[PDB]
Fold:
Amino acid sequence: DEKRQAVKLHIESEDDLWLLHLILEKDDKVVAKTTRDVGESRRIPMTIILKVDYTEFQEFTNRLRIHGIIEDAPERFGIKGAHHTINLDIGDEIIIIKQQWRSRIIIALVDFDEYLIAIPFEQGIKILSEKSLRPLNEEEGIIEQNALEIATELAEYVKQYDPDAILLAGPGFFKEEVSKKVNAILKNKKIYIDSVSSATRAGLHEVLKRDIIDKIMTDYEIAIGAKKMEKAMELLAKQPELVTYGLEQVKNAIEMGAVETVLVIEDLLSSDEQERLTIERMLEDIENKRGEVILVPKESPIYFELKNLTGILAILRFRIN
Amino acid sequence: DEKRQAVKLHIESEDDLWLLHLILEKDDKVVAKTTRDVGESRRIPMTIILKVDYTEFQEFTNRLRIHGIIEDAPERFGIKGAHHTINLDIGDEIIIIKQQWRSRIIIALVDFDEYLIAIPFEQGIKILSEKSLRPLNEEEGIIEQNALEIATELAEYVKQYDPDAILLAGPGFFKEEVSKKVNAILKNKKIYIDSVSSATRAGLHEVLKRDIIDKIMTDYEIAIGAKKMEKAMELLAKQPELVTYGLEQVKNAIEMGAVETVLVIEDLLSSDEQERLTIERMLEDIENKRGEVILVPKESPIYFELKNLTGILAILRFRIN
Structure:
């Protein structure tokens, strides 16, 4: 229902511009900031998803004009289907989606008059709910009431898909309101909060490319590798060697296809010449045999215990001596 | 003899990496820094032109490995035709040349044991001379003698193509030596100097993408627009109006197809809303009728005289009243 192969790009030079001009084809979509003069006239900044028609490099002002029709924008402007021109300059950002191209997160985009619910898969992006609230507000309960309607609307999706983390995002304050609600009905899940200028498919592609996703992913991996280490310690001191550490030991273990899961600290992957390539390969081999690889960052409450043991231990399937 | 449609890219994020991985095809060429262990083993940094085979994104070390054969490198290593892997990381630069894609400058790439001569056209890059000097050195005159052999070798090409500027580039000191010579035989041309790590086709693609080209281009435009302004002043005060300035005046002039050449200061093209688009269009119209457009930067000894007159004057073909 929504592609996942998108690329964010920061226009740093005039060549970044020619590149975009050369590879952006007919029916490709682009996500970027822009201005629209709706109404009399009122110039209002906004972020839209545009399906390209054709691009134009402007020699004199040194910028790229992407021509096309608006695929998505805040519904309150009713501008979908319209033609628009995106003026891309040095300094701007843009997410491109060409046609020819372990933590499950539940995403809720909430604006004060619209909202969207979706879940990202390695496959793609499925959009559960996505509707307006525009005709639903005229004094009374409004905000609190609307937030609740979304929180409820979310709780079903969570229980129904049991995601690892919940991402609450969107333009100012309202999202904090919805957080308050959804939180008031479970306290069983981790809720994250970040802000994007709108609650549309544009804000969605924007959120996925924001730093918050990494944070959610890294908290997950840090957590799984913490319990695993416990599984390692209690197992270590009680089997015994159904656990091993040290580079060489882990290689002979790979040889036998014994590695159930391997724990490796981030350092063993940062500038290590013929080693960073070697370890790198070891790690692909482990997965090429249904092995689990959990990288370990400085901040995990298990990083030091691990580093102590050379920085790489493998929980074994069977003894290797 | 050499493509001109190349794009320089600064790897700033992991997406810059996926992008490269997605658009780099089979027989495309890439120019980048790298290391080669030639010989026993000796790891030596170098810049080569690689014809791609296939790329690989490395999930764990987060980098792209471009696989292929070496199209060009310093001849002293005799490594052309070899297979090599380029390890591209966040922080690196790369110039891509895909297969599916007013100042004439003479370029001389000189290294202490090799050199290259070429001229860039809007059409492409023609490579005049390009040979080794390797077997030509064992005590005696050597440097001075070799420099002279290149200077001579260049003088013919210059007189034969009468280029606007001469670009002397390459790795340390030797280029300064050749400058001294070539200069000692003409003092009739503008010689520029910049440095690249090698004197190959790689160093060439590198030079073309370096700041020096802009400098050469801008000095040219500043010079042509200075004499033109003189042509404007003496013409202004003596025709009379075969010269006009001011935005509106220039538009009605375009209407008649009277603009021979237009002079416009850089400011009229920097953030001017519905104007920067308007002027921009005016300028394309002038060229869409064999008109000459000379942009004017702050530093030209004619910038202020121009700005005085609204910042835009047109030398006319005939009166427009």
